[PDB]
Amino acid sequence: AAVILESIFLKRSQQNFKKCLFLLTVHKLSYYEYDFERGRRGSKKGSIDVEKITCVETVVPEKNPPPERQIPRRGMEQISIIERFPYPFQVVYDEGPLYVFSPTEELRKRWIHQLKNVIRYNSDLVQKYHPCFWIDGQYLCCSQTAKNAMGCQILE
Ligand SMILES: O=C1Cc2cc(Cl)ccc2N1
Ligand SMILES: [Mg+2]
Ligand SMILES: [Zn+2]
């Protein structure tokens, strides 16, 4: 149907970070190049059928992030909201987890809430998720060295 949410997010490529336009509908989560000059979404780079999503949760953030992903001291500025992306969340599907970084806690919340809504009736929703990122061939949370490894932490 229509776009539920449209945001510019920093996403981690399949093992590099890219700044992309993300669109959510009841059918698809998709991502696009952003045409900054014309102020429009550019060419589609990927799509995930919502029915394939098994898990959407927050990700324990990086220990030593670059400035682009540093969490500011607590408490909308035009530059910061397209330059800084320190709040990460994970979308889990058949082809492993996708890591998306939001510029604000509120934007990440909006996305996690709307994604949990659109996936609510999916057949393969999981009871366990990975609180930490997959990095250098292993999950930091449980040291498991397979991306499709069952979640090491039970969802509350
Ligand atoms: O590396 C990536 C980033 C991405 C986003 C989406 Cl929505 C789908 C697939 C992929 N693969
Ligand atoms: Mg537009
Ligand atoms: Zn784990």
Swiss-Prot record:
Transmembrane segments: none annotated. Changing residue 33 to K: No effect on phosphorylation of GTF2I. Predominantly expressed in B-lymphocytes. Zn(2+) binds at residues 130, 141-142, 152. The modification N-acetylalanine is found at residue 1. It is found in: Cytoplasm; Cell membrane; Nucleus; Membrane raft. Residues 2-120 form the PH domain. A zinc finger (Btk-type) spans 122-156. 1D-myo-inositol 1,3,4,5-tetrakisphosphate binds at residues 18, 20, 31, 45. Belongs to the protein kinase superfamily. Tyr protein kinase family. TEC subfamily. Part of a complex composed of EEIG1, TNFRSF11A/RANK, PLCG2, GAB2, TEC and BTK; complex formation increases in the presence of TNFSF11/RANKL. Binds GTF2I through the PH domain. Interacts with SH3BP5 via the SH3 domain. Interacts with IBTK via its PH domain. Interacts with ARID3A, CAV1, FASLG, PIN1, TLR8 and TLR9. Interacts with MPL/TPOR. The PH domain mediates the binding to inositol polyphosphate and phosphoinositides, leading to its targeting to the plasma membrane. It is extended in the BTK kinase family by a region designated the TH (Tec homology) domain, which consists of about 80 residues preceding the SH3 domain. Non-receptor tyrosine kinase indispensable for B lymphocyte development, differentiation and signaling. Binding of antigen to the B-cell antigen receptor (BCR) triggers signaling that ultimately leads to B-cell activation. After BCR engagement and activation at the plasma membrane, phosphorylates PLCG2 at several sites, igniting the downstream signaling pathway through calcium mobilization, followed by activation of the protein kinase C (PKC) family members. PLCG2 phosphorylation is performed in close cooperation with the adapter protein B-cell linker protein BLNK. It is linked to X-linked agammaglobulinemia: Humoral immunodeficiency disease which results in developmental defects in the maturation pathway of B-cells. Affected boys have normal levels of pre-B-cells in their bone marrow but virtually no circulating mature B-lymphocytes. This results in a lack of immunoglobulins of all classes and leads to recurrent bacterial infections like otitis, conjunctivitis, dermatitis, sinusitis in the first few years of life, or even some patients present overwhelming sepsis or meningitis, resulting in death in a few hours. Growth hormone deficiency, isolated, 3, with agammaglobulinemia: An X-linked recessive disorder characterized by growth hormone deficiency, short stature, delayed bone age, agammaglobulinemia with markedly reduced numbers of B cells, and good response to treatment with growth hormone. This is Tyrosine-protein kinase BTK.
